Amino acid sequence: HMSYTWTGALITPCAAEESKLPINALSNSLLRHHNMVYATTSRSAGLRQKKVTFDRLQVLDDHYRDVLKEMKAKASTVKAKLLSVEEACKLTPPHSAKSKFGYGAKDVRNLSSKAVNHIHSVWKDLLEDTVTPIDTTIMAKNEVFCVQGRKPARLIVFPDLGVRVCEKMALYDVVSTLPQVVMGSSYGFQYSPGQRVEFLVNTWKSKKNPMGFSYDTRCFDSTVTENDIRVEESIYQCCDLAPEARQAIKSLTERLYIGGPLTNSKGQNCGYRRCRASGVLTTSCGNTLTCYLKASAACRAAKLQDCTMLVNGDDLVVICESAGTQEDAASLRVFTEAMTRYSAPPGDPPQPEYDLELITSCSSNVSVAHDASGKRVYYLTRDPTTPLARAAWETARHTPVNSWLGNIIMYAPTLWARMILMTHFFSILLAQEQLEKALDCQIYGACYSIEPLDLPQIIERLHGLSAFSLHSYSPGEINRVASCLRKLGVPPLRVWRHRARSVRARLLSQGGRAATCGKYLFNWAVKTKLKLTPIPAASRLDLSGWFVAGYSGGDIYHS
Ligand SMILES: CC(C)(C)[C@H]1C(O)=C(C2=NS(=O)(=O)c3c(CNS(C)(=O)=O)cccc32)C(=O)N1Cc1ccc(F)cc1
């Protein structure tokens, strides 16, 4: 029962790959220690292949079937609809991988006859044939990291453009609607960061003696079995669906989700997958359900008292009622034993935490600062090393995903996003006159095209106005940022405050939406602080399509 089999054909690139941080005139204003930053390339793919290739054994007990029955009872209340071809096409990202059959993502977006005719033919074939495995492409992802020594490239596996549009037709409503019905408040992808921090704090405060822990599954996608994927299909099929949608979903499950052949960029056969594909629509929903199913069942096994789970795909955090520190630790071993029997064994062994701030989930921890009134406010933050490593790369190279922008949006209230990322990138945008130019970033796996001038209103909506007023950050948080800057050779925060005053004056000069950016984003930079009030255009923002579901690998775009 192996996750993959390989033919020995190489995982090959589709363009030149850089591994060394590209340096330009702007690089040194952010980061001096250039040799610390690197991009993964397909040269390391063989190391990743070894890591993701193993045997899966699963033993499923009454706890598992008990939780599953209940999940299915909730799934049976969901009514999901088929998307039209037009609706599915309009969710396709403009720069999505072109089809092997002679059209691209813009042909799809424009509903071009050739595109739409192909999509119709893939759909018909899905309904007519429920056995023939569907071809996928396996690619090495190029991602930027700081050394620690160097990690191998991650692998993405995805079907052709035509199939991706059919997935949407069949499953977009389901993967968007089902998970919150099944899991309720435990489905993480429904929350803004403000909502998520609130849920975490409220949940913590709701226990008499809280204990909390995160669970890291080693290579979760490879731990996912044919059983797991058929189980997911059986949850989908509990929904009230049109007969045509039922067939499409059974077919995609048999032919695509369960497994299939892997083809490299040069068209050669690299092997065969029998685990979760990283690049399908159901990757996030399937991972979330399957992780929640397994963990709920393991919580029962361990007899964890008054558990609340929070699950984003394969990222899992649990907060419960402590039974004492020794009992807690023992319960955790049992928990991990159960997860392992279910095929989800750990990377790091989990550990019990008695302080919310010491838990990492979605790569983030709770911390505390103060608003203008002096009131405590909790916010989500993280070690800034990877964010700043990538910011350094994106200073000198244009990338398909601007991580700096997703980091500003999602970590707006943080010391490091406000002082460094905002200051640095607005300074660049000013200089090139690109404040109004829409950029793409990825939030919960979906692709959004966002104008930098819109950030204040986006930030108010996700975080509230306090994001623009926070101060007296904790010593532990100040210290971690200061350490990171010393590690990467980033100028100290006193330097960034100086530049921010400049960037702010520059933005104020321009008036309009630029001055709003100066006024709200950089109020921290001046001693005589302005009074920040709700931004009118914020209540006007269409944050529909934001924070409904997760869509990692799912080829979803919002305009
Ligand atoms: C923009 C961002 C900084 C990268 C943001 C985000 O979009 C993800 C995130 N994107 S994802 O790939 O869909 C995903 C999976 C996907 N796992 S899977 C493959 O199993 O679907 C599992 C867990 C998280 C995420 C994330 O963790 N972030 C930090 C953050 C999270 C919540 C906050 F409130 C604040 C910050």
The reply to whether 557 and 421 lie within a common domain is: yes
The reply to whether 120 and 22 lie within a common domain is: no
| Buried/exposed 75-89: b ≥16 CB within 10 Å, e otherwise | beebebebbebeebb
Question: Among candidates 59, 63, 61, which has minimal Cα distance to 303?
Answer: 63
Considering only CA atoms, which residue is closest to atom 13 of ligand 1?
Answer: 444
Counted domains in the chain: 4
Does residue 445 line the site of ligand 1, with CB under 6 A?
A: yes
∠ CA(347), CA(352), CA(356), 5° rounding?
110
Considering only CA atoms, which residue is closest to atom 20 of ligand 1?
Answer: 313
105 C-beta neighbours (distance < 10 Å), count: 22
Q: What is the dihedral of CA 335, 340, 341, 343, to 10 degrees?
A: 130
Q: Report CA(312)–ligand 1 centroid distance (Å).
A: 7
Q: How far apart are the first and last CA of the chain?
A: 42
Considering only CA atoms, which residue is closest to atom 27 of ligand 1?
Answer: 362
Does residue 196 line the site of ligand 1, with CB under 6 A?
A: yes
| Buried/exposed 330-349: b ≥16 CB within 10 Å, e otherwise | ebbeebbebbbbbbbbeeee
For strands 315-321 and 210-215, give the pairing: antiparallel
The reply to whether 347 and 433 lie within a common domain is: no
C-alpha 274/C-alpha 295 separation (Å) is 22
The reply to whether 447 and 553 lie within a common domain is: yes
The reply to whether 235 and 167 lie within a common domain is: yes
Report which residue type is found at 229.
I
The reply to whether 479 and 538 lie within a common domain is: yes
> Is residue 262 classed as helix, strand or coil in its secondary structure?
strand
Contacts of 213 (CB under 8 A, 6+ apart): 317, 318, 332, 350, 351, 352, 353, 359
Does residue 273 line the site of ligand 1, with CB under 6 A?
A: no
Contact 23, 73 (CB under 8 A): no
Contacts of 201 (CB under 8 A, 6+ apart): 356, 366, 378
Q: Report CA(373)–ligand 1 centroid distance (Å).
A: 31
DSSP letters of 263-293?
Answer: E-TTS-EEEEE-S--TTSTTHHHHHHHHHHH
Does residue 350 line the site of ligand 1, with CB under 6 A?
A: no
Does residue 407 line the site of ligand 1, with CB under 6 A?
A: yes
Report which residue type is found at 43.
R
Q: Which two tokens stand for residue 266?
A: 């040069």
Quick one: which atom of ligand 1 is closest to the CA of 380?
Answer: 35
Considering only CA atoms, which residue is closest to atom 31 of ligand 1?
Answer: 362
Does residue 291 line the site of ligand 1, with CB under 6 A?
A: no
Taking each helix axis as running N to C, give the angle between helix 403-410 and helix 423-432, from 0 to 180 degrees, rounded to the nearest 10: 130
Last residue of a domain, one of 324, 342, 362: 362
Considering only CA atoms, which residue is closest to atom 21 of ligand 1?
Answer: 284
Q: Report CA(495)–ligand 1 centroid distance (Å).
A: 30
CA atoms within 13 A on the CB side of 155: 32
Does residue 104 line the site of ligand 1, with CB under 6 A?
A: no
Write the secondary structure of 449-485 as one string of H (helix), E (strand) and C (coil): EECHHHHHHHHHHHHCHHHHCCECCCHHHHHHHHHHH
Full domain range(s) for residue 118: 56-132+160-183+225-258+275-281
C-alpha 375/C-alpha 369 separation (Å) is 8
Strand partners, 138: 157
CA 50 to chain centre: 24
Considering only CA atoms, which residue is closest to atom 29 of ligand 1?
Answer: 362
Question: Among candidates 48, 235, 232, 230, which has minimal Cα distance to 157?
Answer: 48
For strands 260-263 and 136-140, give the pairing: parallel
- Please give the DSSP secondary-structure letter assigned to residue 411: T
For this entry, resolution in Å reads: 2.0
The reply to whether 323 and 396 lie within a common domain is: no
| Phi, psi (deg, nearest 5) at residue 67 | -60, -50
Considering only CA atoms, which residue is closest to atom 33 of ligand 1?
Answer: 193
Contacts of 145 (CB under 8 A, 6+ apart): 37, 38, 39, 40, 151, 386, 389
C-alpha 532/C-alpha 468 separation (Å) is 8
Quick one: which atom of ligand 1 is closest to the CA of 287?
Answer: 20
Breaks in the chain (C–N beyond 2.5 Å) sit after 148
Q: Which helix (H) or strand (E) holds 516?
A: helix 512-521
101 C-beta neighbours (distance < 10 Å), count: 14
- Please give the DSSP secondary-structure letter assigned to residue 239: S
Contact 21, 1 (CB under 8 A): no
∠ CA(375), CA(378), CA(380), 5° rounding?
150
Strand partners, 380: 366
Sheet with 210-215, strands from edge to edge, namely: 210-215, 315-321, 305-312
Strand partners, 446: 443
The reply to whether 421 and 379 lie within a common domain is: yes
| Phi, psi (deg, nearest 5) at residue 127 | -80, -30
C-alpha 404/C-alpha 471 separation (Å) is 22
448: region left, alpha or beta (phi > 0 left; psi from -120 to 50 alpha)? beta
The reply to whether 434 and 415 lie within a common domain is: yes
Strand partners, 240: 79
Q: What is the dihedral of CA 70, 76, 79, 80, to 10 degrees?
A: 70
The reply to whether 177 and 314 lie within a common domain is: no
The reply to whether 480 and 384 lie within a common domain is: yes
Considering only CA atoms, which residue is closest to atom 28 of ligand 1?
Answer: 362
Strand partners, 212: 319, 353
Contact 332, 302 (CB under 8 A): yes
Q: Report CA(329)–ligand 1 centroid distance (Å).
A: 28
C-alpha 248/C-alpha 460 separation (Å) is 41
Does residue 477 line the site of ligand 1, with CB under 6 A?
A: no
Last residue of a domain, one of 309, 338, 362: 362
Contact 421, 391 (CB under 8 A): yes
DSSP letters of 126-153?
Answer: HHH-SSSPPPEEEEE---EEE----PPP
Q: Report CA(57)–ligand 1 centroid distance (Å).
A: 29
C-alpha 485/C-alpha 482 separation (Å) is 5
Q: Is the dihedral of CA 465, 524, 527, 475 positive or negative?
A: positive
Strand partners, 139: 156
C-alpha 291/C-alpha 287 separation (Å) is 6
Question: Among candidates 143, 177, 171, 146, which has minimal Cα distance to 159?
Answer: 171
Contact 425, 387 (CB under 8 A): no
Burial tier of 243 (Cβ tally within 10 Å: 0-12, 13-18, 19+)? exposed
Question: Among candidates 131, 122, 139, 96, which has minimal Cα distance to 260?
Answer: 131
Q: Which residue has the tokens 């001693």?
A: 527
C-alpha 310/C-alpha 144 separation (Å) is 28
- CA separation, residue 233 to residues 229, 243, 293, 355 (Å): 6, 15, 14, 38
100 C-beta neighbours (distance < 10 Å), count: 13
Report which residue type is found at 421.
L
Contact 256, 230 (CB under 8 A): no
Q: 204: domain CATH number?
A: 3.30.70.270
C-alpha 217/C-alpha 308 separation (Å) is 18
The reply to whether 520 and 453 lie within a common domain is: yes
- CA separation, residue 79 to residues 86, 251, 314, 436 (Å): 21, 20, 25, 40
Does residue 457 line the site of ligand 1, with CB under 6 A?
A: no
